[PDB]
Design a protein around this nucleic acid. Sequence first.
RNA 1: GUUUAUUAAAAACACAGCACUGUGCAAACACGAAAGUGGACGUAUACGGUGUGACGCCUGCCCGGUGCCGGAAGGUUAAU
Lengths: 271, 104, 77, 149
Amino acid sequence: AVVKCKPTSPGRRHVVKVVNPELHKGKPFAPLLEKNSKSGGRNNNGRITTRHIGGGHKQAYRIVDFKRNKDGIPAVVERLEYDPNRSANIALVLYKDGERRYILAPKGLKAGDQIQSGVDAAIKPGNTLPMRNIPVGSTVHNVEMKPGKGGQLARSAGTYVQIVARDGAYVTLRLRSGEMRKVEADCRATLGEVGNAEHMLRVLGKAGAARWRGVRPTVRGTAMNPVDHPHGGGEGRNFGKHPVTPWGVQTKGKKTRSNKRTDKFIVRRRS
Amino acid sequence: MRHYEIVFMVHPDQSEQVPGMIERYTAAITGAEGKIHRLEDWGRRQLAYPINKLHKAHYVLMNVEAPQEVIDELETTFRFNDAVIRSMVMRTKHAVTEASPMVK
Amino acid sequence: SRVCQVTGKRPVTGNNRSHALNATKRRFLPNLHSHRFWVESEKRFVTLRVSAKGMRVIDKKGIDTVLAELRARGEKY
Amino acid sequence: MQVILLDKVANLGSLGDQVNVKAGYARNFLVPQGKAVPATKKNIEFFEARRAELEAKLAEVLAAANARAEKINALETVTIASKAGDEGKLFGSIGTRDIADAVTAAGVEVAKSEVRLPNGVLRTTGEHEVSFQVHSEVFAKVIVNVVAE
RNA sequence: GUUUAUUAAAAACACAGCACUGUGCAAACACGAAAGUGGACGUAUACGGUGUGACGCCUGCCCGGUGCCGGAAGGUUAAU
Ligand SMILES: [Mg+2]
Ligand SMILES: [Mg+2]
Ligand SMILES: [Mg+2]
Ligand SMILES: [Mg+2]
Ligand SMILES: [Mg+2]
Ligand SMILES: [Mg+2]
Ligand SMILES: [Mg+2]
Ligand SMILES: [Mg+2]
Ligand SMILES: [Mg+2]
Ligand SMILES: [Mg+2]
Ligand SMILES: [Mg+2]
Ligand SMILES: [Mg+2]
Ligand SMILES: [Mg+2]
Ligand SMILES: [Mg+2]
Ligand SMILES: [Mg+2]
Ligand SMILES: [Mg+2]
Ligand SMILES: [Mg+2]
């Protein structure tokens, strides 16, 4: 439920919260946590590789089952939890033999439902089965690219991938970007759209709310000196040049994909 | 309960598996304490027009007096099975028992 | 290190000469490839980071002759 | 790449032939599979005086080791009681090694590289046929019935 | 809120928002002769770049030039 905030102060004027009352109001499950130390966008050389990353609230990492290998054993869903590590909410599930794991929460999943992986699983939102067992034309998420590698496609808060075709060893997918990609028919996928679909309806409202998420401010390139950026300089506002990166690569329109290994897997590009 | 008339259309190469499907469906209905009034295999039959790039199909008529909850379970069985091509469920005012004009 | 294990080839340094004969220092890297060679006597594969010249040497001398030299040189393989 | 052969290869020569090949064909396939020796003049006098008929003796005892094993594989039934769904629609597929696991249990102790399959999956629950490559030339067939568990 | 430590605190920068564009994951990109690492233990409701700068009403015409994208019949054209 989106909640428009009342304008008691500027900085609360434009805030829309996304309030989900079903999330667990307690501590997360302690065995599945581990330390997630921040980086600041800096590699092992100490240099800033990717800009604008730094600060933000401390975040513990939640070990999430993407591989989803407990086949045959049914699992009931204990509660839904908030995950700071990702945009989608996660679900704490309890198998029959007593193991607890975290999965990505699908759209219609709530506390108390039963999920089950494996080939003999039913087709309800939550089950995970190889895509030679999933009917053509259904919406799945948490899709593997390689069998047993773990789900890599359609993991962000409201995404999903449709299965449009199958020719023997491959299935053809309609990715969320609109790209048509071939994936082997033995890769696991999880039924239904992924949960937190109204995540994109939030508006942060103030500058500090982006600093809470560890997003340092972005200085636009024309506000610099020519030693700093190709856009920099000028006596006033001058931009008489084609828009490039800080490293002189065209940005408005120039393609950058240079992977000739995976070109056989791409049916059509995005539009 | 609610008298339904169910007719489904089987892929003709799966014509051998048809009495195995009918006995499960009757056990779905009678297991849910529903009645089955007539049950008329029509065999292979030439289609009026080729559905799904093929020219023949195997027809089964089935009249059922079941509660509406298990028929909705039964419809999903027709949806995900690839042996059945088309399925049509039609609500009927009463229980019909007389033979079909093409069973004749 | 870009060193062929068989022939001992090594990146040498030279010049890029332009049309106006402007000399900038460059390197000549050897055409190294990691290749599994079947040793028939020891009945196993041995990976050697070897140049394509060295693969011509192994095709001429034989892998048993070359691995004798690598032990006589004192080089792991 | 002048090379002497240790076995007949289907497109260039029989045993005892000195035929030009490409370098990548001898170095990657023929020599590492024991099918050819590079034509060194030390190896020719090693081969041509003695092994031109000694290996011909060893080639016959290999085809005779097949023709004893391949002949008794006419029992022509392999019951693999795998889990399946209803009305066909097999639960879990059967690959080459699972076929090789069960013909091991009835007949020749066979390997996973011997099984030849047009589909490989055998998704259809029921009976099927499986061709073999027990020799490079001499082939066998066994009807295999995939049975629901 | 930020800024010229030590003559300039501002209308400059940033900003939430908006849009364009790149990017299917061994992602683009960045630091690195390389191995690797960051992006990210993230997966297009994600990430990078660029411009604009809450909000309200809006954002018209021009593709000739310069870029970028798509095209592959012809002309031209390197080592070989
Ligand atoms: Mg940025
Ligand atoms: Mg911005
Ligand atoms: Mg800015
Ligand atoms: Mg300035
Ligand atoms: Mg410059
Ligand atoms: Mg001016
Ligand atoms: Mg001007
Ligand atoms: Mg000089
Ligand atoms: Mg102020
Ligand atoms: Mg000052
Ligand atoms: Mg001052
Ligand atoms: Mg990496
Ligand atoms: Mg401005
Ligand atoms: Mg305009
Ligand atoms: Mg133009
Ligand atoms: Mg034009
Ligand atoms: Mg062009």
